[PDB]
Design a protein around this motif. Structure first.
Motif, PDB file in Angstrom:
ATOM      1  N   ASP A 280       0.835  -1.193   0.000  1.00  4.59           N
ATOM      2  CA  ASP A 280       0.000   0.000   0.000  1.00  4.59           C
ATOM      3  C   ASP A 280       0.876   1.253   0.000  1.00  4.59           C
ATOM      4  O   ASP A 280       1.867   1.325   0.734  1.00  4.59           O
ATOM      5  CB  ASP A 280      -0.925   0.021   1.209  1.00  4.59           C
ATOM      6  CG  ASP A 280      -1.954   1.131   1.124  1.00  4.59           C
ATOM      7  OD1 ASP A 280      -2.412   1.394   0.010  1.00  4.59           O
ATOM      8  OD2 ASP A 280      -2.301   1.747   2.151  1.00  4.59           O
ATOM      9  N   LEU A 281       0.514   2.224  -0.837  1.00  3.15           N
ATOM     10  CA  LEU A 281       1.192   3.519  -0.882  1.00  3.15           C
ATOM     11  C   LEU A 281       0.235   4.648  -0.490  1.00  3.15           C
ATOM     12  O   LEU A 281      -0.928   4.654  -0.902  1.00  3.15           O
ATOM     13  CB  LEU A 281       1.743   3.798  -2.286  1.00  3.15           C
ATOM     14  CG  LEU A 281       2.713   2.819  -2.949  1.00  3.15           C
ATOM     15  CD1 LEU A 281       3.050   3.264  -4.378  1.00  3.15           C
ATOM     16  CD2 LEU A 281       3.987   2.651  -2.122  1.00  3.15           C
ATOM     17  N   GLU A 282       0.704   5.606   0.302  1.00  5.36           N
ATOM     18  CA  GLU A 282       0.012   6.892   0.346  1.00  5.36           C
ATOM     19  C   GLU A 282       0.804   7.834  -0.556  1.00  5.36           C
ATOM     20  O   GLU A 282       1.994   7.641  -0.767  1.00  5.36           O
ATOM     21  CB  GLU A 282      -0.115   7.444   1.765  1.00  5.36           C
ATOM     22  CG  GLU A 282      -0.842   6.516   2.742  1.00  5.36           C
ATOM     23  CD  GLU A 282      -2.217   6.040   2.244  1.00  5.36           C
ATOM     24  OE1 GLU A 282      -2.570   4.870   2.528  1.00  5.36           O
ATOM     25  OE2 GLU A 282      -2.954   6.825   1.595  1.00  5.36           O
TER      26      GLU A 282
ATOM     27  N   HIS B  98      -6.417   4.686   5.046  1.00  4.51           N
ATOM     28  CA  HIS B  98      -5.580   5.737   4.464  1.00  4.51           C
ATOM     29  C   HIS B  98      -4.310   6.007   5.264  1.00  4.51           C
ATOM     30  O   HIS B  98      -3.694   7.062   5.160  1.00  4.51           O
ATOM     31  CB  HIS B  98      -6.396   7.013   4.291  1.00  4.51           C
ATOM     32  CG  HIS B  98      -7.510   6.863   3.307  1.00  4.51           C
ATOM     33  ND1 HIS B  98      -7.307   6.369   2.035  1.00  4.51           N
ATOM     34  CD2 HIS B  98      -8.836   7.110   3.411  1.00  4.51           C
ATOM     35  CE1 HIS B  98      -8.460   6.331   1.393  1.00  4.51           C
ATOM     36  NE2 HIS B  98      -9.403   6.776   2.205  1.00  4.51           N
ATOM     37  N   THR B  99      -3.939   5.031   6.077  1.00  2.39           N
ATOM     38  CA  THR B  99      -2.567   4.868   6.505  1.00  2.39           C
ATOM     39  C   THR B  99      -2.063   3.695   5.669  1.00  2.39           C
ATOM     40  O   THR B  99      -2.858   2.828   5.297  1.00  2.39           O
ATOM     41  CB  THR B  99      -2.448   4.576   8.007  1.00  2.39           C
ATOM     42  OG1 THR B  99      -3.080   3.322   8.299  1.00  2.39           O
ATOM     43  CG2 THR B  99      -3.130   5.671   8.814  1.00  2.39           C
TER      44      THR B  99
ATOM     45  N   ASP C 180      -4.291   0.058   5.710  1.00  3.31           N
ATOM     46  CA  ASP C 180      -4.941  -0.424   4.503  1.00  3.31           C
ATOM     47  C   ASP C 180      -4.265  -1.703   3.994  1.00  3.31           C
ATOM     48  O   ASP C 180      -4.909  -2.543   3.365  1.00  3.31           O
ATOM     49  CB  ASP C 180      -4.966   0.677   3.445  1.00  3.31           C
ATOM     50  CG  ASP C 180      -6.025   1.743   3.745  1.00  3.31           C
ATOM     51  OD1 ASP C 180      -6.812   1.547   4.696  1.00  3.31           O
ATOM     52  OD2 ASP C 180      -6.093   2.768   3.029  1.00  3.31           O
TER      53      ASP C 180
HETATM   54 MG   LIG Z   1      -4.310   3.443   1.735  1.00  9.15          MG
END
Ligand SMILES: [Mg+2]
Ligand SMILES: [Mg+2]
Ligand code: NA
Length: 226
Positions: free
Chosen positions: A15-17, A185-186, A190
DNA sequence: TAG
């Protein structure tokens, strides 16, 4: 099948933000990898009940979660949902996406029994091309060269079609487990949510992953560098 | 259609 690339030995939930959505030429602010051996997935107990409880994460797991300073500010929309900003990342001394980061990722991947397959939700349209673009900027060689990847949206679509609706991460999780996911949305929140939906039907997931894995080097970058 |  024959399996086009053999059995995937390690699944890497990813997962990337980032600072924004694809047309904004976004840059990564946070990255999380969760490496799980396929043995951990085949050892996951069958999801019984309506609803089934959220599967228990494997005991044995390698985890990497990193905050990263992007080269440009986050869109206001991105900051409000991720809780991150470029400036505050820098106040906290976070470094750019750099050669050292690439060396870190490579060494993390090399700990895993090969081959590795990255798994990301909408990865085919977001995470993989974004990551491809970040690594492209570096003169450093790609640490993802002999790695594979799959999009979990395609996986869960096939898995549920094997049993209109939304296939967003949270929608799927709520439909499977009748609970809201946590820490959305961390990068790590996620990723753990992603791990759970992929554990819903672990054997079918592995089979599908083995059949649809594709080399990460075939992933097209999201946008061009100078 | 899914930071
Ligand atoms: Mg995320
Ligand atoms: Mg994501
Ligand atoms: Na299964």
């Amino acid at each position: 099948q024959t399996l086009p690339h053999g059995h995937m030995q390690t699944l890497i939930f990813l997962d990337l933000e980032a600072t924004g959505l694809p047309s904004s030429r976004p840059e990564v602010t946070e990255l999380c990898l969760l490496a799980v051996h396929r043995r951990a997935l085949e050892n996951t107990s069958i999801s019984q009940g309506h609803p089934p409880p959220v599967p228990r994460p494997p005991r044995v797991v390698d985890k990497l979660s990193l905050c990263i300073a992007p080269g440009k500010a986050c869109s206001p929309g991105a900051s409000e949902i991720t809780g991150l900003s470029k400036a505050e990342l820098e106040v906290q001394g976070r470094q750019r996406f750099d050669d050292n980061l690439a060396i870190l990722l490579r060494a993390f991947l090399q700990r895993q029994p090969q081959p590795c397959c990255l798994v990301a939700h909408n990865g085919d349209r977001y995470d993989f091309p974004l990551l491809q673009t970040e690594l492209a900027r570096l003169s450093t060689p790609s640490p993802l060269d002999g790695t594979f990847c799959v999009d979990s949206i395609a996986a869960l679509k096939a898995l549920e079609q094997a049993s209109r609706k939304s296939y967003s991460l949270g929608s799927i999780y709520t439909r499977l487990y009748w609970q809201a996911p946590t820490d959305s949305h961390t990068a790590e929140g996620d990723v753990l949510t992603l791990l759970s939906i992929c554990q819903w039907k672990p054997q079918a997931l592995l089979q599908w992953v083995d059949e649809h894995a594709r080399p990460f080097s075939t992933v097209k970058p999201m946008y061009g560098t100078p």
